[PDB]
């Protein structure tokens, strides 16, 4: 069984037509959804980039790993400072880790990483962690020199001037498939396809931008207040600047990026079938964190889930998830059991038939039963973000268990309890109406924190 | 507060952009949803028309009223017959029901019915049930003579040649709004606006249809297979015909009908604001049963909810629900607690400060705690549809409780159990895996059935 893991950057939970978008159009991804299972309660294990990507590669929670913030490679930003100081974090995937690429490669797989990496400098590139190929992956968190050739990526040779990064990365993925077919498909492959989309700057071809300016016109959206200024930011480096929340999906350039992305998923999936590998490829479409909605241009909206990237509220942790596996997963099905990033590692091992290495810690759970149509025992899901981020949040930790969600904020020690079944949008803090429910979820969160050795932000005495 | 209850016909749970549509465009309704509470687990109390509309007006489950099938005013088709015989039902709203129109009128409201009625002949028109006005409601369940003027609708005077009925029904609602303003708004109004949209036949202006042929071609959907033939029907009158399921949302004419419906909703709410009534009007958008996905043209698809109109599966009972009440409902929020059609009666009465009459049964439960952001105690939700219907189902009854749904099928007494949390699309019957859970749900359904005096289909001994 091949694994094709399509990992979007910063794609919010309502950023697909098939997961609830009111403006964006994603016909090729919609088809994939029709051919597989979609997950309504799909989470990333962190509200920003590198920790969720480290959690994916290791099947571990970010705090057990030590990578709990997005990696600022040249220390010009972290640690951020407010009333608290950002906690320190390991600025790369820790060296001793045994990744899913290593496990699968040890079990006979071809392992390819394509696209965004963001897990350290050259000593911690994909090749040191079980990957045979690295096309376009480096230490950058986004296209530092834009989406148009030249890109500046040391592991991606430049294309003709005017080449679009998202198109080229797809070509690179299509090239690996056809190459493998030419050599006889000796081994099952494992592709970690990490798009640079849809991270800022939102740079798109003009035909794709204009498409959705016309639609926003004929739809009336051009006349609707999309951005709304809110509170002041919380760190010294943004003193004076206010949080700008986007309250409606209407951004035409952002829609164009997603339209272009959808054509590329079309190209990619058509190559996979042209290689006679559709029947036996597990296809996963997901994202590393929630949509960007509260700063840096606010290209998208995640309402009725609150806020977005950088926040521990639902809008920042929720994420689309489609899984297709012909013959095994029922097409056009849906599952509502909470699923999180560290779950894929043991899922893939179970689908490959490969035992776990003794003694490595695994915080995730194989979702193979859900992919079959069966419930599983209730388990909590956790977050621990002891940083501010750039988007408006403040350091916090979180547990979801059943219908309830507990959040504690490190600035003032306060807790917030939500009944997400009755109150999906987190409008009604019921901490004090249910002290008992709060105390259980608070203690559960603290015990997990002790077990994974979480670090906490220290007060700022300046 | 005023009540603008917008009651669509046969609109599936995924037929709006703001509730998961992949093709349809509903800007004016998306804005409504951005201004209120959307309900992710919204249910109609019956998979076909008349029982749910009777259940909405009286706050009782259809099996208690006796109206358990859509009303067939000629003896053309009911009772349908296969292995079993359709059960008898009352073909009108029963005489002594104290409906929410009466309850609010007696509390000083002005009451208006506009549009589809389908609750009996002349002696059971809205005026016999507490409404002061009835524009366009008769015994018809759909535009017998089409959506383009003339309509032959006994309570709607014909419009100029080519007038579109949904445009016209909206114009009548706007008129009532402006008349009340001219008169100085002496009383709060309760408006029961029942569109005939989106019932077959799917007739639309060509500019609307052509806009979504264009869209289907730019998205590639025009060259996909959208309709799939299936099992045979189950009744003598459709012997030889096969269920035809729609598997994608791609029908341009239906898309065009929802697009016109969206313009008119925009006109109506604009008029609501132009009369300065926006801030103190409870606005509800919902529908009477699930979308038509399996017969009679299969205009929409309800997937991942299986099947549609006329089945007790999720696609037949799930329905969109948005509630807007400025200053009271948080704008752009979302509740996942199951709500069902008979809840509106006690919700509206509580919102208006009116006590419910003594000694009248009410199976519904006010949802104002949910409109406030508060949870309520867990309750089961029930269905009793002892008829075949036209869309390919078989007589069945149903209870949803927490994460579990149990279905009993009258043809053979087989039971079906689904974990709707793990298995939303009802893929995996776990009745034999969790026997105690099944027996508990079965006995609760049977006890409810006893208490409401539900009737059961008879075996057709000639089969
Ligand atoms: Ca990211
Ligand atoms: Ca109906």
Automatic annotation (TrEMBL), chain B:
One of its GO terms (molecular function) is metal ion binding. Its cofactor is Ca(2+). Keywords: Calcium, Hydrolase, Metal-binding, Signal. Ca(2+) binds at residues 9-10, 49, 288-289. The keyword Hydrolase applies. Residues 1-354 form the Sulfatase N-terminal domain. It comes from the Bacteria. Pfam families: Sulfatase. Gene3D superfamilies: 3.30.1120.10, Alkaline Phosphatase, subunit A. Its EC number is 3.1.6.1. PANTHER family: ARYLSULFATASE FAMILY MEMBER, ARYLSULFATASE G. Belongs to the sulfatase family. This is N-acetylgalactosamine 6-sulfate sulfatase. It comes from Hungatella hathewayi.
